[PDB]
Amino acid sequence: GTNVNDKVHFSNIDIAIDKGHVNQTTGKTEFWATSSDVLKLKANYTIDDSVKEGDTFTFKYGQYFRPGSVRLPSQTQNLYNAQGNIIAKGIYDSTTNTTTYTFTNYVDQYTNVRGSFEQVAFAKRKNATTDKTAYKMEVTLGNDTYSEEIIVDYGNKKAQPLISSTNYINNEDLSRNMTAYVNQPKNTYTKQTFVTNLTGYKFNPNAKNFKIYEVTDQNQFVDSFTPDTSKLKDVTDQFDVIYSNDNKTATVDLMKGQTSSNKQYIIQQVAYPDNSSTDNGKIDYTLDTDKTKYSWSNSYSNVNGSSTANGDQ
Ligand SMILES: [Ca+2]
Numbered sequence: 156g157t158n159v160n161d162k163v164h165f166s167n168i169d170i171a172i173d174k175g176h177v178n179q180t181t182g183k184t185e186f187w188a189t190s191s192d193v194l195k196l197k198a199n200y201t202i203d204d205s206v207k208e209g210d211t212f213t214f215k216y217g218q219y220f221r222p223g224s225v226r227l228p229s230q231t232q233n234l235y236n237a238q239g240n241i242i243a244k245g246i247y248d249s250t251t252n253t254t255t256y257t258f259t260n261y262v263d264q265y266t267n268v269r270g271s272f273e274q275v276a277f278a279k280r281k282n283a284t285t286d287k288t289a290y291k292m293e294v295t296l297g298n299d300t301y302s303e304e305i306i307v308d309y310g311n312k313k314a315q316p317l318i319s320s321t322n323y324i325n326n327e328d329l330s331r332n333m334t335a336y337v338n339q340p341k342n343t344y345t346k347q348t349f350v351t352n353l354t355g356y357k358f359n360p361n362a363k364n365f366k367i368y369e370v371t372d373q374n375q376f377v378d379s380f381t382p383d384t385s386k387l388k389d390v391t392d393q394f395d396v397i398y399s400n401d402n403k404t405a406t407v408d409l410m411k412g413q414t415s416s417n418k419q420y421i422i423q424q425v426a427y428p429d430n431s432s433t434d435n436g437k438i439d440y441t442l443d444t445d446k447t448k449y450s451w452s453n454s455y456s457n458v459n460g461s462s463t464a465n466g467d468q
Contacts (some may be wrong), residue, residue: 156209156257160297163212164201168301170220170276170292171195173458178306185306186278189320189380191456191463193224194276194305198296202268208260212243216252216276217293217302219283224275225455226324226462236261236270252279275461278307280322280381286311310466311378313339317349317442317449320380321464322423329434330427331356333453334380337409337420337442339373344416347409348443355436356426357402365405367391370419382421390420434462 173195175184186192214222222228232245232254243256262268276292283290286308293302312318319335337349358365368375368387375382397406405424410416428434435455442449453466 156211158212159203159206159210159258160212162203162206162210163297164203165198165296165299165301166200168196168198168294168296168299170294170301170303170305171197172305176308183306185308187308187310188225188278188280189310189464189466191465193458193461193463194220194278194292195273196222196276196294197271197273198301199271200269200296202262202270204266206258206262206268208258208263210258210262212256212258212297213295214245214254214256215295216279217291218252219279219290220276220292220294221249221252221279222247222254222274222276223326224277224324224461225321225464226329227326229326232256234270234272236268240264242268242270278305278379280309280379281383283307284377284379284381286378309378309380311336311376311380313376315449315451315468316340316342316444316447317440317451318466319438319440319451319453320466321453321455322381324434324462324464328427330425331436331438331453331455333422333424333426333438334382335422335424335440335451336376336380337422338417339376339419341373341417341419344444345410345414346443346445347416348441349407349409349422350441350443351405351424352400352439352441353403353426353436354439355434356428356438358398358405358424358426360396360398360402362425364423364425365391365396366423367394367407367409368421368423370421375421376419384421384423387421
């Protein structure tokens, strides 16, 4: 095959926020990634007649934008013609944030071939880290580049002693990969009982993927809830995580034997759906402290095959 990025022409390119939340102060539409929104990429295209089966073309996504929803994008990506046949089979590489498509025999079925597509998309959370910030969302389809500014707000309320979000949903097993932030305000406690209770999911203790990281720098609390754990101090083995209710409940005393603590923590967990008929469910967190019990909750909805997530106190 040949690279035919110069022979596949995209037009009417747009990035939508679905549904989008209007900021009642500025009047602008925002992307509230932890209040059920996703992005959508849409375009029409034409294909020169010299293109043949096996020729390739790319969608290159920019540093703040990726395909997928709360659920990470599939490695395999089909593009369908208006008749419902697969015109191109794609391979998405997360390291290069690029899908390479290979045309099928269907590109040779007709002359003057024309198609369109709508693809769910999202912020690249490890890069678009910060709330209430406009990010250039960019894509190059073939050789056609498009971008628009999208204000992202993940709702990381820094004054809250307990807040949690879905980091991502795994595309292969539909597991919820969670991030909870404990003590962003850096208060001092003598009691700190951290409880997670799952509805529709279970933990797997033997997988050793309930992780506790001690924060040493306030910037580690990225608003996107996708922190770079490779840079953090992994203190998990210092704590006793107690499972109950057939692995639906996890309890940990974050004081770990100390009389007083103003330590701050990032906690990551993996919650597996009970079965393959649905991945809906709910995750409830509580932090019981000296004089206050804090609560945060996470819920999900599937919309036309994209995963959406909502967190709330
Ligand atoms: Ca738009």
